[PDB]
Each structure stands twice: as C-alpha cells, then as structure tokens.
C-alpha cells in the first residue's frame, strides 16, 4: 500500500512549492535552501543549493549590493516562487534570501543561467513566509515574454510593489531581465501600497494565494485586512495580458455560501475545466475555464482559519461578466471606485460615453477599480473539522474530479455534479502518516494517472485512482468514482484501459445495471444423489461462449456446457461429495471463465442427508425435499426406495403423535395401568416388534411393554414405579413411547407422567388439603403424614381430606413475627408467620390480638395457614410488652397459639441531627440520631411540610435526603411519623442560602 | 378403752380407701367388692356391691364391651379410687374389674348415677394393686368439672395413659362424662409411657401414691424405677389446673435427709396447714399449704421398703420456687429436659426470651420437663423398726399435730416444731390388736375430735386426744400434748372446751407453773391435840367462794371456812383421830369443791404421839415439836403440862442418864457399895421419894435404896447379892435405877452389874488364873478350890494368883487327843485337849513330846490351859506307839501329864 515518496534532506528545510513539466514529467520541488529536480517516481536527479547564507532582513539594499552594518545570522532561504518557463526551457526560482532576489535555472541540470540583482525591482520582497507570493508568466507568439508577480511586502511599501509586471526576455543575458515592463514617475506597470494605508492600519498587507491566465487576462486571488477584531477580505484582481499602464486593474470580493455559513477566507485555488455536469450547471462550453477554490468560514482568523471550510467553483465567464457589469455601471457615473486601501479615499465614478467591450482594458479614468458586492461561487462540498487546505482538479470521462487536501494529511476525492447536491466525496485517502497538512501545490503526472502531493517534510505520488479496492461489481459501480468500472471476466474493479478485452461484448460494466447473479436448479441435492445435472443461469452476464467451468468449493472443477446465459454442469461424484457434520453442508458453487481464467460469479449450493433425520416429523419438516418411508422406518430423498408405495409420507400431518388426556397421575409403589390416546399409530410391519413405554426417571428408567389397540390408543401394562430421594412430592417425568426397539413416536405436547408420593413437599395438613383434589392425596392423622386412603390404614373412618375445603386443620403455632417492636400509637403492620393456621381469612379476622390490643388483619397480604399480616390498633395500655395471640376462629383451648417471644411497645425519640443546616436546594444527607428508630412498618420524615427521601433505618439512626426548601431560608420543623405515632421535637433544621 | 370400729364382711374383702364428707360427717369406705356408707360412729347404712364378677385381665376390651375367648374366673373388684365430688353431691368409685371402669354414686343411697363404659379411656387400668392410682377433682365456679387421674398401667402402655385429665360434667347423663379433656393425634390431655421405655426397662411402671390441688396447680407424688439392683425415684409432678395440652408438665425428685440417712422412697403423704412453728421455720403465712410425707430409707426395695423411715414436710411455696427456678434456667438454654423415661433421649433446653411468671403454664418448647436435683424436705421425725406407713395432720391452737400410722398397727402423735428438733412424738397408741399395718387413707371427723384410721380388715375411729390418761396436773402439763390442760376443780386432764368453767379464775392450767398446790399450817399435830383449827392455803386456785369441805382421809369431812384462797378447817375430834402403829401416822388432807362436788387438791397431814415417845432422847429428837417432862417422866407437845417449869427438856444434850465407869464387879455374898456416876439427876420434888437400885436377877431381884449425892453421882448401900445355880461364873445383870417408886432413869449404855462367883465354873487351878485379873479371883491350894484372898484363910503367905501369868500350876491332865494315829514321817497336827495346862504359850512350847519324839506347838491354834495344837517331828524311831507327854514348863514330877491312851505310828 506504499506510494512513491521523497523526503526533505533536513527537518527544517521544509518544502514550499511543486511543479511538474507537462512534457517531460520531470518533477521540480521548491524547498528551503534547495531546488530539487526529480524523476517521475521521485528519484532525485539534481539538488540545486540556494542556502543557507548569512543575512539580516534589516539589510537593504541586500548584502550582494551593499555591505551591511547589521549583525548577520545564518539564514534559511525560503522558496517563494517556482515557475516553469516553457518557451525557454528554464525555471524561475525566487527565495526570501537577500530581499527576495530571483534565479533562472536550466531545466535539465538546474545550472544558473542568470540572477538579476543590480536594479531595485530585482528584489521582490523580504517576506519569508510561504503562501504570500504568486506569479504568472505570459508569452504570446510575437512577444519576448512577460511576468506578472504579486507579493506581500511586509510594510516595506517603498521597497517593493505589491503587484507588478516584469520583462521576461527570451535571452537570459538580457540586461532588462526582470525589469519593470513600464517604469516612469506616475505611470508604471506596478501597484504600490500607499504609505497612509499602513499608517492607518497595520500590519496591513496583501497576500497572493493564487494566480492564473485565462483568455486575454491574468487573475490574482488575494487575502488582505479590511480598511475603515480584524476582518479580512478575499479578492479577485484582474488585469489584461497587454496593459503596461495597469489601467485595466479591477478588484472584487469573492466567496461562497451554504447552509447558513459564509465562506470568505481564501485558502487555495486551481484553474481547471468544468466537466459535463458543471458545464450545464454554469451554462458554459465544456472547454471553458473554471476556478476551483477553498474557503474557510468567516472573514477572521487569517493566521489560523476556522476548520469549517468549503470547496467552491467560479466560472471564469461569470467572473468576467460581473467585472463588465461593474465597469459599465461605473462608466455610467454610478457610485464610487470603492478601493480605499489604494485610493485612500472615496472617489466618485466618472460618467463617460465609452462602450465597455468584453476585452475592455481600461483608460485613465475610473481606475484602479474596486467594488463591494462579492462574486458568489457554487459551493460543491464542505467539512466541519478536517480543514481543507488545497485543491486540484481534472476531467475524466466527462466527470469533474476534485482532489482536496486536508490539514491532517488526508486527500479527498470529490465528484463534481451541479445542484442540488453540488459535489460528492467518494473517497478519502490517508496520505501522510505523520498527519502533516497538505500544502497548496498539487500537480498531475503528464497523463493524469498520478497526483503529486506535498507536506512540509514530504512529496508523495498518489494514484488518482485505487479502483481495485472495490471487490464486487456492486461496490465498484456505486462508489461514485469516475475512474472505476467493473472488469467482468477478471472479477476486478479498474480503469477501462486496465481491463483486458474491455472493448468486447459485456467485458466492462460502466453502470450498476450492467452487473451478475447466479441461479441454480436444483439449489440443493441429496448427498446420495451424485453426478446430477444442474441448470445454472447467469443474470446480466456477458458472452460466456468462450467456455465455462463449474467449481464446487474445493471439491471439484468440471467443464460446463454453455448455451447463452445458461450453464449445465455435473455435480460431484461419489468419491468427491462432502461429508455432513451431524443435516446439510453448504459450499460456494463457482463459474470460471475460460476466456480469462477467473472465477467471476458464485452462489450457495447445499448437500443434504435426508438420512440425517430419523423421525418422521423431523424428516418431513426438513427444509429440503425428504420423504419418510413408513415401513422401512427411515428418511430418504428417493421415494421409490420406500418398501411399498403406501409407505411414502410427505407431510407431518400423517406422521405415525401422542394426544394428551387429563394429567397422568402415578403414585409410587402402586400397580396401575396407563391408558393413552394418540393418532395414526402404525401397525408394525414384518420384522417389526410391538410398543413399549419408556419412563425417563433419573433414578431408574422403566421399560414396560404395551399394546396398541388401534390407531388411536395405547396402554402400558400393570406396573409400579418409584424414584429414590423422597425430596420432591410431585415429579414430572418425560416418557417416550417406542416401538420396534428404537422408533420413538413423536410427542408434540411433550406429555409427561407425574409420579407423586404424596407429600415429599408437604409436612403439614394445611398444605395437603391445599393441593389438588385431583391427586386424591389427603392428610392422615395417625401417621402425622399425608397420603391416599389406600396408603393409610383406617383405624377409624377419619383420614381427612378437604371435602370442599370445609375441613378445619388444630394446634396452631407461631414460628416468628416481623416488627419485633412497635410504637404505642399503633398502625404497625405485624407480619406473623406460623405453621398450622386457619384456611379462610374470615376466621382469622378478629382472631389476632397483641396481648389485649386488637389487631386487624389484611386480606391481600394474608397467605393461608402460612402467614398473617395484621395492623395493630391504638396501644396506649398498661403493659410495655405482650405476647401475640392467634385464635383460629374460636378461642378454644386447643385452638390458640401464643408467640414464643413477645412484641414490645415503645416510643421512638430523636435527639439531634448531624447536619443542622443545609442549602435551600436540599439534597443533604441528614443523620437523625435517637432511640428505637427502627420500630414499626413505615417511616416518613418530614422537614417543613415537604417530605424527605428515605434511605436506610437503624435503631440508632435514620438517614434521609432533604427536600428543597420550597420555603424560605430559616428554621424548619422536623416531623417523623411511624405508623400511627407522630413524634416531634425542639431540634430544628436551618435552611441556608 | 374401746373405740368405735367397723369390720370387713369377709376376710378377703380388704379395705382400700376411706373418705369423710366434710359437711355431713358421713364415712365412705372403698373396699374389695363393696362400697360402704357409714354413720359417724361407724354404723353401716348402705352397702353397695361392686363384685365379685367373672373376669380375666387378658380380656381387653372388657366383657362389657366385647365377648372374651379367655377362660373366666370369679374375680375380686378392688377399689382403686374413691373421691367425693362435693359440687354434685356424688361419689366417684373405680375398681380393678373390667379393665378399671368407674361408677358415679349418689351420696345419700349410693344409687348408681352412671357408669361410663363405651369409650376406650373410660377404662383406667387393669392393675389390681392398691396404692398405685390417685385422682384429683378440680371444679372452679364457671367450669362444669375436671378430673385429674394418675395410674400404674401394668405395661399396657397403649391401653392406658399413666396420667390424664377428664371431663367431669355436672350432668351425670352427659355423653362426655370421663372423656379426655382434650383428645387429638398429637395434642391430648394425657401422658403415655413410651413403648421403648418398657422395652428397655421392665417391669417399668409409675405408681401414683398421692395427689392434691394447691393454688392454681395440681400435684401428683409418684414412685417409679429409674432408667439408664433396681433403683426407684420418687417425684413431684405438677400441672396447671387449666392446661388441656399438658404443656405445663414438670417433674422433680424429692425426699429428705437426717443423721446420715437419705429417705427417698415415698410411702405416703397429706396436704395440711403449717402451724405457727413451721410457718416461721419455713418463712410462710400460717394459711399456706404444707405437704407432709412419709419416706423409707434409700431408693431400693420398693415392694418391701426398709423399716427405717421418716416424716418430712415440704412447703408448697418452696416446691413452686424450685420448679420456677428450673423453668427459668431451662428457658435460658441451660442443660437438658432430663426426663428419659418419657422423652426417651437427651433433649437440650431451648433458650427463649419468655418471662417465667409464678403462674407460667408452659408452651410447646421445653416440655415435658424433668430434672435431677431433688426437692429437699424438712425431716421432722424418724423411726428405725416400726416402719411408718401413713400420715395425716391438722392444726390445734397453733400447733401442728401429725398422726403417723405404722406397719404394726400403731398410731404416733407427733408435735411439729421447726429446727433444731423438727418434731416430737408425745404419744403412741396401739390401734389394731392384730398388728395389721395402718393404710394410707386417714381422715378427721368434721370437727377434728376423731381420726378415722383403717387396716385391710378394719376401720377404727380414734380420738385425737386422750388427755384423761394423765392423772396429775404434773403429768398432764408436762406430757407435751398440745391438746391437754389441767382442769383444776375436777382434777382432770382435758381439752379446754372440755373443762367446765374453764374461763373462770384458775379453773384451767395451761402451764406446769399454774399447778394447784396446798399449804397447811400446822402440817402436823399431836394426836391428843384434837379439834385444832388449821390454815389451808390453795396456790393457783380459782374462786372457792362457792364452798369448800375438808376431808381427812377416810376419817372426816367437815365444812371449811373460805376467805379468798385461804381455807380454815377443824381437825378430827377425839373419837375420829387415827391410832398410831408403834410414832406418827400420815394421811391425805383433801378439799372438796361445793360447786362441783369433786376433790381437787390434797397434801399430806401427819398425826404424832408426842406420847408415842417414852424416853427423853426419843422425845427430844422427834421430827415434830415434842418436850420431855423431866419429873412427870413423859413426852408432850404442851410444855405447860410439865410439873415444874424446871422439868422442861427440849434438847437431848441434857437428857439426863447414867454414865459408865469401869466395869462394876460384884462378888456374890459380899457386902459392897456400888458407886455410880451419871448426869442431870433430878432433885426429887414434893411428894416424891428417893432413889433405889433394882437388880434384875432372874433368881432374885434386889431392891436397895440409894442416895443421890448430887446431879452427877449415886450409890447403892452396903449389901450382898446372890443367884442360884452355880452354873455360870460371870453373870451380867441389867440394873435399873429408879426414884419415886417407878420412875426409871434412862440407861443408854445399858450398864450392867457383873455378879461373879469364885469358880462355880472352874475346878482347876489353870482355869482360875486363866480368868480375868480384874475378878481378883485366885486358886487356893489347901481348899483345892478357888476364891479370893478374903475367902481363903492364910495358913501361910501362899494362896496363889497368876501375877503376870508367871505362875506354874498343878496336876495337868489330858482328857483326849485328836489324830489317834499318824504317819511315821511326822508332820501331823496333834490336837491335845486337857484341863489344867500352862497359862502362857512360851512354857508349853518345848513341853510337848510324843514318847521320845519332839513335837512343836503352834501359837495361833493354842487355847490357854484348854487345848494345845502341836506338830509332830520325824518319827522313824524304834517304838510303834508311845504315850503323849506335856511338861508345863519344867518336867517336874507333879507338873507332868501323860495321855490315857497312846498315839500310834503307822
């Protein structure tokens, strides 16, 4: 995954600019202290040295013109401009060293041709910051050459023009090399920043981000502070290619807007062609120029632009038009020139009957010309965090593809479409692992297969395309990547020219609709059904007539027979069929193109083992075509192998099932028959044995033979059953009905036999009578145990069973009761748990008493004969504590129960609170200390009518969380109420602000 | 001495139980084959028959429920329970017949009201041995009735509960009569002996000796074998009166100890009140309950308990306390329940915060409850041989009186006092002559005057007290019998309420110090001093003002004069005074109350005869006030009757008398005066003659007048005396000195005059000189006779008298000698008797010879001049026999004697 790359010789010698020779493919890198020439794959050929050199920016004129008194420092020479002069096979390189002098280098060896340094203007600027200077070379046929150059000046407004045109004579040894194109007192090919403007506003300067030639004009894109937080303005500056007087100078703001965000800070730009979608969107020819630009949100933070940034497009035509309209309105006498930083003041437009042509190049009046109304671009794409930093674009197959660098070293691939979407990112590559921001200069290899991209530390050759990353025709043709098509027979996503035989029928899909799927019939076969002929159909296929082979996973590959989009193939033979893990086994059935040699389509093919099913219902309900052979008692794929035609079963409905009856109750140790009902029981055929019932009891499994009366009924013979443990009274046991030794009849309901021993579970009379009347299990007095009448001897007629329930059950006892203590006021909910209580609520009611005190029981809370929940009444009585009494219904001497331990009455009290004070909002953890705090059922804590949130309770303390004082700050009462008792006290709680 | 008694109709139909109706006094006896109703004095009114009936103990259910296949025998119906149901005027009687069915009988006629017999529990037990079952009826006001019953079960642990509570409805015809108070599978008003316990130990059983209700509880006292010789344990079993579930069941051992003996085998018991002494000893109110119990020594021999047995007392309060402490420690989780025969095993107590009140009636946990540490009683009394067999008690005048039966038919009356003594037996009655043991059931008549006591053959009504047996105030009030006081005027030991007028002054003595006594002055009178007034004082007397009479033994009864406690009476008159046996004569002087008619006090009164004394010394030394009248020569009580004031003698010192002098020697036929000495000789007064001396000689009594020189000396005048006979040389004669004719002066020494004759007695010279030197009688040669110098003429100076004894005598002769023969060897003691031998031994020694053979005489054996005892020397000499020779001192020719017959040697 590694691209060709070139690193800087040193960590401080950062890269600045980059250009590729359109004809040679030679790569030129403008760097600190170095100008590099490299091969296509970034192998260095020449390293031209440009620094460092001792210098001082205060030294003006430079050391090469004058000796300097200032102290010198070894200074880095920043590349500030790098431009190929194609006509003259040379390269222009200008550094920051010595006030910004320039060099001309020969392309092949970078040998210095000349270095103009005697005239004042031969020094461009002392600024040592990149992204502030840009140049454009313009040389027609009959002209020797011209250079337009714009630069920040660093306040040295008298040292350096901000924009100017220079001579670029074909002859390197011309004395006028880099001289002003025109230079007189009041008419020169240059613009100077007025002294008054720097005085008014500093650090006022003009930064030249980008420049280009289009038609009969040159264009510069600038950023500069605005003139009366610091606000900046991004502008388009236009000049005619032929205009020594600079009378054609005109300057308009520009930017773009989307989704309520104005993007006004220019970051980067690139001239390209529209592509079909934008050409239509802009109403222009497909070979007209479009300006692609990056802007950051707003008009502030020039040195650290907002991450929120946008890619925008400006048709050159739309720009020229807005410029013409401006010229026209001005030459009609409307408004002012509106360029304060230069004109210094308000200057009114002068009306003059001059026709403003498309190629109007200005006059003496109405120039230079500014303007306030911005040129609006079409916003194509925006990001919120990974700030866009660079841009390059080109047209592939009518699609405008835009490459956008990011501050984190990512490269975005945007496909440009007009409204309403604007642009779509179809890929983002991670180019620089160190996360270094992508610099402005990006350039294509001569045939646009690669895009050269740079960071401060690195130049990297990035493939325009990585289509191979899409592994299905679907992914490939829906990626949105203009370069990517589907190479059908090679099963590969690639460029058309990368797909072999792409020009032949259906070899290359350019549209999702031109993609494949594979249909097989049958889509599954019995494992025993080998050497089958299968019918394969290829949807959306190309010519397969060259030949097709079928691959059954790893198992097999046989030559298929081809007729159109239909393929016929023989399935694996006996030796080669897969083995099934114990019902089926899937694999990918694949077609290999004989034309290309590549597998290009696939689909799942499954082998099954009807034999895997060994019960009728299982076999029948298989997902695959299986048949149950009634008599042969097996599952098969081939119905003709059943013993008789009558033996074939296809649906579960007629599978020889057991129907349910009322619950099967079986006592342990008693001889009983178990009649069963069922449906479609088979008559055992020749060589087949009869029916048995198998009981799956962990302790012991019993095998009892049975007789099948008819299709509907069965019956195990008289036998007794038992299990060891005596742990559980009611044990349900799964039973399986088998015939012929191992054929188990299906049991959908999963009917089970309940083996009961009369209470393993119930030690008490109340529990037995509680249980089902069905069991017939009942309590037997003498044993003090519980079993059926059969099981218990009749000394007398009495063994007792709850007839309807009208059976009283003696000797009630109380094990333990909750809420040991309680408040004297009462209201407490006493929870009494006993063994042998009354069966009905109505009897227990009025039964309960705590000593003298009457207690009223609660119905819902009352669990028969196990537990009684009762509410105590008003206790102010003589005794401190008293025992609890239960009277089953009559307070007979046999019939009463007394508690082992006695219930104690008290009266809880509270002395103090851990935090006395707390905030009005509340939420304070209060700790109230006292005595007998634990008593009773419920607790409610009260501070100033609004309740406290309870947490935990203890004998000693109660902890709760305070409510907001809905009240005002100050003292508040604390009321605590437990049940019926409400206790109050002098300790108070103070709410604080 | 015979009490009211009732005998059994038959020798085999033994008595079993006994109860007395507190209100009617009706006596009900539970016996074999009979229930008897009797009157207070044991006269039979109704005899209700209960047997015999054909039966077999193997027949269960009984014949009245099921036909039996077992062979039947005519069976005796033993009374096993007999209880009066006071609320419902009926009686509960349960026999051994038919597995122990019960009957209810109407009190008045013993007509059967009902006989529960359809339900299993209606049959109590097949045991046919008495003293194994006991019941207690408990019926408050709002309840219809309840019966607690405990019984031995005879191993039929599934047939019969050992302890249970039953319904006793007021309505006799109730269908639930004698039904369990509560009956369910695992909760019933009953305790059953576990099967495993009988298997482990047999013949394990529980015997219920006694039962009672006290406060809010019922109590049963049991004996049973101990569980791992056979050791038995006696226990107190307590239950709350109201507790159908029997959760209140608790059981502790009990007994008592004294003098290194543990009494642990329960024999009998009885609930009573303490009496003051025990109430203080036990620190309880005098109306709290006390359990009186009999125990035998040790914990073995249940069927024949040791004779060594004890009576003990247990305050109910002390019992309840020890039970509470047990409950408390258990409900604190300490130790086990400790009742193996029932629980079967070790069961740990369960700690639970339950307050144990005085009236705690148990819960489900920690019950039934046993224990190992015994309840110790206070030992009141013990016996070693007559084994105690029964007990009953009550309080009389603050004294706890305990009645204890014995195996030999004796009834002991014990007075209970606390430590250190414990109890004191103040009486033992023999109740049954046949020696039959006293049975357990004893009961008081309604007013506790009698105690009904029974043997197997007999019911006897025994008086609580028999105070009349004490016949003197002293015996009565020192018997130690709380019932007995002294009824002064009736001279009777009795109960206070039995003494007439007991509420009047001094009529009833409750203390020995209050015993009457009688003082008389004078306490003795001369017999001649008749019709005297005497002053009688009655100490500790009651009002005598009704009248008093004095009785002088049988002799007299005269009306006395009464002033307070003083009585004055006239002594017997001349005709009626007693005669004295020859100095005095005592009799009982008695007072008879005119109010009651009874003699009630007495004291000794003596009559004397100063006249009875007839010698001065006798009269003077009398124990009574007598005076000797010197001149009138008589003893008197009245000194003013002496002749002269000078005649009165009061002390013996001046009783006049004749004093002795050297012996008075009087020769016969010689004129001699006899001077005498004496003391306080009286001067004869007017009309009185002088003194004479009278000699009392049988032959002749001589009267010689004498002169009294002074108070000290007398002398008979010159006269000669003689007596006829010549038989005895020395004749002492009593002499009496008389004056005034017949007044004889006293002679204490009884001085006599010796009349001696020169030898009437002695024919030989040796005998005279032998006699007293005093006589002066001596031998006179010429006469060949013996008389005084005066009597024999002196031809010459020679008449011979043994000077010192150095006088040789003449013509010795030998009459006869003993040991005629002798051995040649010698050594023989020769006894020679002669007439006229030597006076001294020293002369005779060396005198004696038998022929040639020397013979040595013996000093002690030698009697002067009469006999010589001599020892012969070695005889082997020539002669066979030889004559014996005596040489008085010198072998003079006149001086030698030769034996008439000769001594022979052989």
Author numbering:
A (entry chain C): 36 to 263, 273 to 626, 629 to 1039
B (entry chain A): 36 to 263, 273 to 626, 629 to 952
Q: What does the original paper state about this entry?
A:
We determined crystal structures of the full extracellular segments of mouse PlxnA1, PlxnA2, and PlxnA4 from eight crystal forms providing a total of 13 independent structures that range in maximum resolution from 4 to 10 Å. In five out of 13 full extracellular structures all ten domains are resolved whereas in the other eight structures some of the C-terminal domains were not modeled due to fragmentary or absent electron density. This indicates that some flexibility is present in the extracellular segment of plexins. Some flexibility in the stalk is evident on comparison of the 13 different structures and contributes to the ring diameter ranging from 84 Å to 99 Å. All our PlxnA full ectodomain crystal structures have an intermolecular plexin–plexin interface in common. This interface is formed by blades 1–3 of the sema domain of one plexin molecule and the outer side of domains 4-5 (PSI2-IPT2) from the ring of a second plexin. The residues in this interface are conserved among vertebrate PlxnAs but much less among all plexins, suggesting that this plexin–plexin interaction may be an important functional feature of PlxnAs.
Class A plexins (PlxnAs) act as semaphorin receptors and control diverse aspects of nervous system development and plasticity, ranging from axon guidance and neuron migration to synaptic organization. Plexins are large type 1 transmembrane proteins comprising typically ten domains in their extracellular segment, a single membrane spanning region that is predicted to be helical and a conserved, cytoplasmic region that contains a GTPase-activating protein (GAP) domain with a Rho GTPase-binding domain insert. All our PlxnA ectodomain structures show autoinhibitory, intermolecular “head-to-stalk” (domain 1 to domain 4-5) interactions, which are confirmed by biophysical assays, live cell fluorescence microscopy, and cell-based and neuronal growth cone collapse assays. This work reveals a 2-fold role of the PlxnA ectodomains: imposing a pre-signaling autoinhibitory separation for the cytoplasmic domains via intermolecular head-to-stalk interactions and supporting dimerization-based PlxnA activation upon ligand binding.
